[PDB]
Design a protein around this ligand. Structure first.
Ligand SMILES: [Ca+2]
Ligand SMILES: [Ca+2]
Ligand SMILES: [Mg+2]
Ligand SMILES: [Mg+2]
Ligand SMILES: [Zn+2]
Ligand SMILES: [Zn+2]
Lengths: 330, 330
């Protein structure tokens, strides 16, 4: 029905972002899923088109309303920041600043409702810093500019959406970090994102910390009752459809069967293993809790191959697809 | 190829074991996979056959060599322990002892090389104790009679075999329990069982404790280096094909692709979630470290339905199939 507008940020101009965007938008499949709007540098996209041997024309626009989404011609909100001769594959404070400016513009468009999702091409933290934007990372920058303190990481597969209470932390520290506030906010973020994506009443299942969710006290130190159950109870009383804590393995079986719209995993491997085992296109991370859904790829600026036309666009295509499926419905 | 002999133990005569055994062996598919030998009570199997409306005849035999494996006629190593009138659905000291005696006989047969796998029908712990056999459970009794201090639990799916260093224990205590001796033995058990099943040099992948296996010390308290790596190195030096610790999720991806014959999971949910998400026939547990592979079903003696002919044999069929696949090759 509605084809969502996806704001695609070009990332660091010295890295593979421009090339991967231009290769991605040569696929007709993209235009079955979304209306792809590039925020970036029009000249850099033209250079990338030459580098990849593409047939893409670039249309310089100022406002999202000017975009036509005609295959063969990329609509680029052109900030004009990148010198024509900026080298590929080397650190650039100018490219770092421009990567920030593309992200800032994306956040602005998301706030005004002019895009329905963000898909971020890679940037380089060192260049970002040199360019005057000393953020801890790409995701942290999006969150700060959006005005939110926390986001959650989600993985998506067929029948499976898995949002994480904790991710990149040691397992012992993970268990310490989980408590009802963070669990509650993780569930809320997942619920809100699925409502935006057109599921009016998301069916949410929540994993235990212990196997079998503790088996009525048989396993563990009461982590379910201390850390999880108070959040679940509060959100049930608010009217959300939340079940758990459940044995994580049983919940994944049921989710795969179609019983749940969302699985809330407590820690990294609990949620990541069941998605990764399926062997699907790797490298896409979903960020939950900004004004619109955001996706990205995990491959980096790849300076060793930047400007050589060899970067593979498969991960980006999947990031766009996942972004389109979770985009805000209008 | 060789059809392995599976020693099927009848379990507790008051429970659903006899019924599920008689229902299972009515399936022609079993006979394409194995030669099914029942250790139990011939009169009880006859009574079960009447109950389930079957057409099975029972042949009383003394020695495994007598078994004919003719469809329609179950070869039963008949210990003659169960009175004809023993009620279904009630605890019995005689039934509890007989369940122990069937297991004991299966262990003897495995030791002499007269069966290639064991598949156990359910028994009842309270009845076992009532018959003078004070074991913590079914699996513990098998281990004790076999002469081993430890076994490991394994789950099997297409392209995935996942053996666990720890299972039913809280997550904090699991990480404490893991140390290099236990890791080493888990890997050894897994390797030996796959060699028995005809994989000369098993390719083994080992999971980390921390996500990303610690990411070079970024996550966690050095658990990989303390608890896992000394075991992996020792076994590599001894000539086993062992890779890890690896990020668990990456390892599951690779295993699903065919890169490993065995995945060594550190704790319950790490290994169980990726198997269960696949949504395949549930209920089957594989015990590794006895003289031959052993499988079993989760469902218990089910005294509430014992003797009524309603017990479903799906789980037991899958337990037989998995047992046949992992049976000792001759
Ligand atoms: Ca975290
Ligand atoms: Ca254990
Ligand atoms: Mg190509
Ligand atoms: Mg039937
Ligand atoms: Zn990760
Ligand atoms: Zn379990």
């Amino acid at each position: 029905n509605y084809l969502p507008v996806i704001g695609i940020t070009m990332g660091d101009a010295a890295g593979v972002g421009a090339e991967v965007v231009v290769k991605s938008l040569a696929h007709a499949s993209v235009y079955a899923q979304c209306r792809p709007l590039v925020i970036g540098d029009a000249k850099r996209l033209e250079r990338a088109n030459q580098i990849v041997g593409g047939e893409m024309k670039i249309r310089r626009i100022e406002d999202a309303s000017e975009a036509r989404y005609e295959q063969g011609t990329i609509d680029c909100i052109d900030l004009g920041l990148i010198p024509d001769d900026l080298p590929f594959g080397q650190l650039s404070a100018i490219a770092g600043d421009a990567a920030y400016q593309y992200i800032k513009r994306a956040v602005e468009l998301a706030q005004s409702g002019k895009i329905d999702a963000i898909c971020t091409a890679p940037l380089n933290k060192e260049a970002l810093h040199a360019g005057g934007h000393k953020y801890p990372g790409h995701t942290e920058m999006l969150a700060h500019l959006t005005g939110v303190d926390e986001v959650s990481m989600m993985l998506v597969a067929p029948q499976l959406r898995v949002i994480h209470v904790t991710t990149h932390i040691g397992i012992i520290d993970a268990i310490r970090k989980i408590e009802p506030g963070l669990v509650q906010r993780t569930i809320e973020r997942g619920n809100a994102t699925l409502v935006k994506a057109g599921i009016e009443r998301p069916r949410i299942g929540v994993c235990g910390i212990n196997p079998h969710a503790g088996e009525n006290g048989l396993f563990g130190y009461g982590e379910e009752e201390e850390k999880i159950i108070p959040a679940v109870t509060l959100l049930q009383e608010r009217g959300l459809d939340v079940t758990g804590p459940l044995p994580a393995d049983t919940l994944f079986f049921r989710a795969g069967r179609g019983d749940f719209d969302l699985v809330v995993a407590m820690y990294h491997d609990q949620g990541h293993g069941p998605v990764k085992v399926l062997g699907l296109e790797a490298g896409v991370n979903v960020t939950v809790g900004l004004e619109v859904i955001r996706t990205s790829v995990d491959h980096g600026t790849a300076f060793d191959i930047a400007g050589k036309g060899v970067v593979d666009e498969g991960s980006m295509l999947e990031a766009l697809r996942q972004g389109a499926e979770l985009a805000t419905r209008r």
